[PDB]
Design a protein around this ligand. Sequence first.
Ligand code: CHL
Ligand code: CHL
Ligand code: CHL
Ligand code: CHL
Lengths: 175, 175, 175, 175
Amino acid sequence: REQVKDSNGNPVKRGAKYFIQPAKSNGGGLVPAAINILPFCPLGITQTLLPYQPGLPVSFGYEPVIVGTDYIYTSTTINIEFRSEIWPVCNELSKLWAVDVSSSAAKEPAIIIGGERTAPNSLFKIEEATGAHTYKLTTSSGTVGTIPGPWLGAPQLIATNDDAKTLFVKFVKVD
Amino acid sequence: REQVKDSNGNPVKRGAKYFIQPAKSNGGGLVPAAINILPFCPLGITQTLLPYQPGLPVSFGYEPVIVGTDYIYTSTTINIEFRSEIWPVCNELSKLWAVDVSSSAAKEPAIIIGGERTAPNSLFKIEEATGAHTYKLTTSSGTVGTIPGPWLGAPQLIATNDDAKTLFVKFVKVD
Amino acid sequence: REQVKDSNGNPVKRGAKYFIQPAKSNGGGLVPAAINILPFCPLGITQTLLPYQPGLPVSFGYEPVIVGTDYIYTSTTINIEFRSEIWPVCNELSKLWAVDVSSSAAKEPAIIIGGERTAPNSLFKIEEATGAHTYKLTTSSGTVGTIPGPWLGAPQLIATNDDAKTLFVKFVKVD
Amino acid sequence: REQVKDSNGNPVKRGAKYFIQPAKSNGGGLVPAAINILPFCPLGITQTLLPYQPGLPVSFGYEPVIVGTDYIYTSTTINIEFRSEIWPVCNELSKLWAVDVSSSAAKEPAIIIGGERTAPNSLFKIEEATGAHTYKLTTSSGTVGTIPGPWLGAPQLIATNDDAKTLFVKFVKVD
Ligand code: CHL
Ligand code: CHL
Ligand code: CHL
Ligand code: CHL
């Protein structure tokens, strides 16, 4: 277990805002986007294709609670939540990431938004990967990966046992 | 081979307008609807869920050409085209039904709109089923069936080898 | 005051389902449609451009209550509500028609959906017009008219003091 | 006439990429967004409400041509064009800004996207305003201003003679 480092080499602090940015990519950061038409709640998570769009900010917090430290460590369960004043749709749902565990869940399930803090489908871990300050995300439903999704095939986040799909990311401190 | 009959028992005439109406259903007729977000062309085909919506009209014509008869027969290749003055999207494409044979085609492929008159993926046959004036549609990619689609799970037309999915229809003469 | 007659000459019954159909038109009936993008609630009301689309059904009821008669009369306050099992958006709002009296209300205000039974902006009257079984609708904000709206300029219902905009309708009994 | 300066005090260079960023605001930069539902082409221009969204990049070029200088000066006609590899809709139209001069043009007309290089409705000027490196944009249809538009009332660009609506901007060099 080590301190997760942001793209500047500084440790990632609990509750602080980060953009999650796919590594070795021409696209921007991770953002909410609908994966279904109607209903469109809950939203999925997508890499925007547009180069200078940094993503929607997230913050990390330990779950279950770990008291005493300000830093996020690898291989330890956290919640990931989008941080936005403006949120016009899907308001009956939270902004925590979670694996889709509904009855319509794909064999390789969507990462959606609206998980319950304590539910098991809401628990992620950050794990080191090769490259500087490059990481992967894992859940109890598999590694976080992408498939071409409904927005011009923009990467769409799923949980997957296929290593080829793994999403490698950096955390860019919101400045 | 027999004359296909409309819901009033009258033979179906080439080039005349019919609604295609799922049998034993509380929903309305078959209509264009997007199956993808962006791009949304080509459109797919859906049963509307709304009870009094009769569908968008279609017409049937023989392909290859059969000269001499005014009536549509079973077990004979036809094109099916939507008939609408108003058509605001997907205008570079035709209004003929076709099986999706693109590279992103699902294992059970979508019925889409925009087929070429002569292409093989544009050829349907009407086949008798049980019930009065009830029929099924077949293509060289399988029988026409539905799966719950993106519009509140409204039936979405596919080509399928699964008999459980078969869409049974009547043709209601546009009056 | 006279009994309002449907398109077959039969009196209009309280609580029964009617389509509202613009007279002397090539379009279909009146339907819910968004007049704003985001938020899209509350919905407005539009004439569909498509020829065989009959509209979404409505029912008429007296407000304030008139007890003893089964029939709708002219020049008497009623509510108009859309009647639909399926209603996927704007669910915190009712299906009663009402004049928009919000703070963003246009000088010629939109007819919207989601009025309170007793509120004054929810009160319509049916008034005779020329032509057989042709009527107009009025509210305390003006006569019901249309302007070209956001759906390919499809007639969009407003309340207006301009006689040129008046919407003439028939009521087609849902069969 | 002076050299227009970016947000770092450096002169603005012809053909280089800038974000246009409203001054004294909590929102992000200027972006394409639909102002009509259907058709949605041509697109309008909006300030995104989201704080860290920098805008879609633009570049400035003299029109009519001014040969010999690399810098953009005030009070001189230019074109403004969005610069994006990805452009999925409205492709029959250009990416140059222009005042809407169609027959449905509002009394205070929309700034749209898709102007012809030489047409007069495509000609902007940058003019100094108070504040450091703060500017306004003007056209022969009036000063560039905003009204609350259809995206949660996000500022929507118009041409206006009302000084209260003026949009004050800085140009942030795309890095
Ligand atoms: C209704 C829910 C909802 C939908 C549909 C979307 C959709 C999208 N978001 Mg998300 N979001 C949604 C909720 C929210 N988002 C965000 C915050 C963000 C941010 C910060 C960003 C996104 C972005 C995106 C886009 C990422 C895909 C891309 O690369 O395309 C790019 C493709 C285009 C730019 C072309 C135009 C897309 C256009 C905006 C929508 C086009 C609509 C279609 C024509 C509709 C078609 C209908 C079909 C069914 C017929 C995608 C358009 C990213 C983006 O790229 O935005 C520009 C982005 O940076 N979202 C928040 C917090 C405020 C939400 C709250 O609910
Ligand atoms: C952009 C392309 C396009 C899209 C998205 C649709 C979509 C639809 N068509 Mg089709 N059509 C489209 C092209 C065309 N249609 C038609 C002709 C028809 C007819 C005659 C009918 C349809 C109907 C339908 C609907 C059938 C599903 C249902 O049962 O839901 C019913 C669900 C509702 C009524 C709820 C509201 C739906 C609303 C109109 C759209 C909601 C938009 C979402 C909020 C957007 C969400 C964005 C996401 C990505 C975040 C569906 C909404 C049927 C229908 O039901 O219409 C009412 C119908 O009867 N279409 C023509 C010829 C003119 C087209 C030409 O291009
Ligand atoms: C999200 C809310 C909502 C929206 C956007 C609409 C929109 C519409 N309704 Mg309504 N409805 C909505 C709620 C509901 N409707 C209905 C019941 C009906 C009925 C019965 C009918 C309508 C129809 C219509 C259409 C009338 C205009 C027309 O003539 O165009 C016709 C234009 C087309 C057919 C072209 C394709 C339209 C397509 C379905 C939507 C296209 C989406 C755009 C690409 C999105 C663009 C995004 C922009 C911002 C970039 C319009 C598309 C009528 C219709 O024509 O449907 C086909 C119709 O008959 N509605 C119910 C009860 C179930 C609703 C419940 O919430
Ligand atoms: C279809 C055409 C089209 C539409 C509808 C839009 C729409 C939008 N663009 Mg634009 N764009 C479009 C074309 C393009 N855009 C861009 C590049 C960008 C950038 C870089 C950005 C935008 C952003 C925006 C948004 C600015 C408003 C805001 O503050 O809301 C914010 C509101 C939300 C985030 C909530 C969710 C919005 C969601 C993406 C769409 C929701 C759809 C509705 C549910 C549909 C409702 C249907 C109605 C009719 C019933 C708005 C959603 C900005 C943005 O904020 O994106 C996130 C932004 O940063 N656009 C390009 C170049 C690639 C385009 C090319 O065609």
